[PDB]
Amino acid sequence: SIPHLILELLKCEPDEPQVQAKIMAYLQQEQANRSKHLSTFGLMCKMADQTLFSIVEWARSSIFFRELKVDDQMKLLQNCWSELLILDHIYRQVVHGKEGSIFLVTGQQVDYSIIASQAGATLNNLMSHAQELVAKLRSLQFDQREFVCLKFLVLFSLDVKNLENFQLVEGVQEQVNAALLDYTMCNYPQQTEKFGQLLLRLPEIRAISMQAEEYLYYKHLNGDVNNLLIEMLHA
């Protein structure tokens, strides 16, 4: 028993193993071409850059989104690209995560104490707030159906202005919201709080991602980061 709409969003999900194998392959070749004479932060920028390519390809092929004109498509992705990265990170730790470890889009597992040594104070703070979201979502039994809904609520955001077809963005927001409310009610009838607890995470994810952008823009002006990641920071 699943609303037809949530099924339509599920069929648009990419094959996770193939997205991850591709990113892993790209990063292997890049390191092969480098002479011994790339910081860990630089590597993560490369990894997130490749993740943005697959996010664009996903959205491009997704229901509703593929009906928007290119200009409207660009405005939506420029407003939520960072939220989608952080949301995919969070869901990655929910499914595969382990305390003291961070699972990357490449399928690799890394120790928290290794990363926390290098990330710096600001990223450690943002990573910590994300982990607190992980633990919260894990105790709620965050599943894939609820995940794809939140992905579309992030993508089709009401904060996006100057759209030619704002009616569609508003319609998707409304119908995905109604389906999630129905899905949690039917499949978790004993969790009155689940719906609200899920939606209350979107503002938190927004804050983490907007602060992550501001930090990455700072790191770029510092000369610490030209690819898709840069283009999205400036736009």
Partner: peptide
């Protein structure tokens, strides 16, 4: 943002 428009249009 030329790169983003290209990724949305390319065949």
């Amino acid at each position: 943002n030329a790169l983003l428009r290209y990724l949305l249009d390319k065949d």
